[PDB]
Structures are given as structure tokens and as C-alpha cells.
Write a protein that binds this ligand. Sequence first.
Ligand SMILES: O=C(O)CCc1nc(-c2ccccc2)c(-c2cc(C(F)(F)F)cc(C(F)(F)F)c2)o1
Ligand SMILES: O=C(O)CCc1nc(-c2ccccc2)c(-c2cc(C(F)(F)F)cc(C(F)(F)F)c2)o1
Lengths: 12, 12, 209, 209
Amino acid sequence: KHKILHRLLQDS
Amino acid sequence: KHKILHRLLQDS
Amino acid sequence: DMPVERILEAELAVEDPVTNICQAADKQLFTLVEWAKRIPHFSELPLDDQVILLRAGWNELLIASFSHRSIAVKDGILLATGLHVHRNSAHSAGVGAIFDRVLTELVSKMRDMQMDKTELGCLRAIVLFNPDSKGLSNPAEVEALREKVYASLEAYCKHKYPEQPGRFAKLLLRLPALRSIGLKCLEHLFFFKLIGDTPIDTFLMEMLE
Amino acid sequence: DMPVERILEAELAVEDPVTNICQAADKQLFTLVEWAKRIPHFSELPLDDQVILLRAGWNELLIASFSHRSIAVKDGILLATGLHVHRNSAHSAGVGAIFDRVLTELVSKMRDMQMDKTELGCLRAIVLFNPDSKGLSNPAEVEALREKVYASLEAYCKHKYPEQPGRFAKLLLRLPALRSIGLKCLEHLFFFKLIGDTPIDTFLMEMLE
Ligand SMILES: O=C(O)CCc1nc(-c2ccccc2)c(-c2cc(C(F)(F)F)cc(C(F)(F)F)c2)o1
Ligand SMILES: O=C(O)CCc1nc(-c2ccccc2)c(-c2cc(C(F)(F)F)cc(C(F)(F)F)c2)o1
């Protein structure tokens, strides 16, 4: 459940 | 080298 | 055919941070429908085209509203639920970049020119009457309606702020930023939905499917 | 300070389908720089801001040009290299959706209103002078320059087409479509680059890194 990390990686 | 298939799948 | 008075009356009628944002979006999707129903001539379009116009527009329409609502706020947005998202909350939740684009391109630009609610309503009505929306049975008609909103909006601007001949152009030229920001916001919501880190309520879910 | 005559003179000065498109883009990136250097006051901005303005804008600027070039074409775009991409070529290469958005939202809208080259030049100059571009040393200045282009453009429209009071608004209201389409086109090029199915020449490569 690594919310912030997943969000920051997915982004472009 | 499946150009058209890859292009049509990547798209949103 | 398109009085700015009716458009204003439509704005006035309807008056994890990412969880709060998603709850507020869902809540405002219901309000959005009522708003649209009070924009002159919208409820007269075919049901299919009403659905297309709101499916093409809802994201830009919600962003225009919460941006204008947030004028009176330092480094935050006011949600329809009465909660604020502060810069640091947004950044801490991993939506800093889009939150900063919202403040710099919309909120601070609305505040700096003192965009009024008639002007907001018009911009939102222009957005609603989007003739590029795919599958419209009669795009010409939607374009006519858009032409009448912006005709009304220019007249309002010329009368109300005669000292600012550039005001009309300046309002129109927030619509590219609204388009980009709307698309970026969709992309975030698709990602939230996909990884399913956050509750996405039924109406918001439907707008993304 | 911002004569439409100089902007026109700038347009006139610079006059696998996906491989051909990518070659044409690269070729036009060089032309784009020369064009920008002939827009009044651009070459006076700090070098850093010139770079930011062109990095923020090149995609919308290339799309505005090839769309306007393609006015005289049935169901195709004219590339700067003298090649056409026909609807069916674009669809067959897997870029049908974006090609259709280009024809419906830009080319046919430019053709239908007979957008002239002065009007194209102005819209491109408005795009160039984008005050939302990140890292500008002086955004106020870029915004002033944008205000002067659109001031000039309205005056031109009022004088040249006095019978069309909505023309100015109509030109401005192709800029949201240009923004969306520009972003979609970037997304395709990033994908081409990533899978590396197609040659991407050095200047186009640089604009994507
Ligand atoms: O309270 C309201 O009127 C609606 C609230 C709302 N409504 C929205 C909204 C925006 C686009 C589509 C649907 C909802 C968003 C939204 C805002 C941000 C922020 F960065 F500004 F904080 C980010 C995001 C997102 F994560 F999606 F990037 C959303 O917030
Ligand atoms: O010849 C010129 O002036 C530039 C040619 C050009 N210049 C561009 C262009 C567009 C955006 C950024 C860079 C180049 C594109 C472009 C066009 C399409 C099309 F669908 F309209 F056919 C698609 C794409 C893309 F694959 F990227 F989706 C590109 O084409």
C-alpha cells in the first residue's frame, strides 16, 4: 500500500 | 516488430 | 436567447486529501447536472447530446468551479465539502505538480483579474457547449449556443469593465490551461481507480468508465 | 509594438507515414526557430525564456502550421516535405484517432471560417508567448507580449472582417483543441521513442528529452 511512491512513479 | 498493434494498445 | 443573468442565476443556484477530493468530485457531479439544466437551451438539446456534453466537460467544469471558489484562499483549494487542501497536503499526497498548476494557471489568474461569477458561469457554459464533443447529433446547434454565450460574455465585459478592452480575450485564454489541467486530472483519477488505492464513489466511477 | 504585418511576414518568410511525420517535424523544428526570431520582441527576451517558450510550445506551433497548410486537402495533411498523409494511411499506421481529431477540430474549422495567414500567425504568436510556461524569469513580460498580439489580432479581425463580430472569439476558441491535440501528439511521439519502432532525428529527439 505505497500510495505516494506509486502516484509519483506513474506520473509523466 | 508489431508496429500497428503496439501503437493501438499503448493509446488511451 | 442567452442572457448572462440566467447563467449567473445558475452559478448562484448550485452554491488522504485524494479521498476528500474524490468525495467532493462525486458530490459536485450531482450539482453539475442541476447547474447544466439551468443553462438556457441545454435541457432542450437531445438527451444523447446532453450526456455527451457533460461526459466531455465534467472535469473542466468541476475544476473551473473549485478554482474560482479557492480565490479567497492562500496556497489551498476550498472543496465543496467545506474542507481545504493546502499546498503541503497536496504535495504530501503526491499530487503537488497538478495542485501547483491549478494555483498558478487558474486560481491566482482568477484572483488577479477578479473574475466575477457571471464571467465564471459564461466560461463554464462555453465549456459545456463544446461543439468538438464526439457523437453530437447536431454539432452546428451546440456551436451556435457557444457563439451566443461568448457574444453575451463580451457584451457583459464591455459594459461592466469598459476600462479593460482585453478582459474578454483574457477570460477565453484560461480555457487552454483548463483543458490541460482537466486532462492531467483525468490521468490521476484513472491511476487512482486502476491501483484502487482510494474509494471512488458511484457517479465519479461512471464518469471514468 | 506588435504589428500584424510583421507576424504575417514571419509566416511568409518560413514557407510508414509515422516515419514521414517524424522527419517533417524534425525539419520544421529548425524552421520554427527562424519563425520565432521574426516575431516582434521574441529575440529580445532572455535566451533562457526563448528556450522555455519554444520547449513549451513547439508541438502546438507545428500542429497549427501543418493544419492550416492542409486546408486545400481532402481527408489528408500536407507535410512540409511535400508528402501527404491520407486518412487511410494514418488509420493504417495506428494514428487514425489523432489524425481524425486534427481534421475535425483544426483543419476543417480553419477551412470553414477561411482562417487567413495573419490570423494563423497571430494564434501561433499567442501560443509562443505562453505566460504559463514553467521557469520564465519574467512571466508578466511574456503575458504583456501575448496581450499585444491578441489586441492586434482583434483590431485586424474587426477591420478586415467587420461582418463577423464573433471571429476573434472563434480564433481564440481553437486554442483549447490545439492544447489537447498537442498533448495527445506528444504522448504518441514518447511511445514511438520508447518502443523505438521509428527513426527520431536529433532535434525532435532533443525536444522530447
Ligand atoms: O470540491 C469540488 O468542487 C471538486 C473538487 C475536485 N474535483 C477535482 C476533479 C478534477 C478533475 C476531474 C474530476 C474531479 C479535483 C482535483 C483537484 C486536484 C488538486 F490538485 F487541485 F488538488 C487534483 C485532482 C487530481 F487528483 F485528480 F489530479 C483532482 O478536486
Ligand atoms: O509537416 C509539418 O509541418 C509537421 C508534421 C507534423 N508534426 C507533427 C507533430 C505533432 C506534435 C508534436 C511534434 C510533431 C505531426 C503529427 C501529425 C499527426 C497526424 F495525425 F495528424 F497525422 C500525428 C502525429 C503523432 F503521431 F504524433 F501523433 C504527429 O505531423
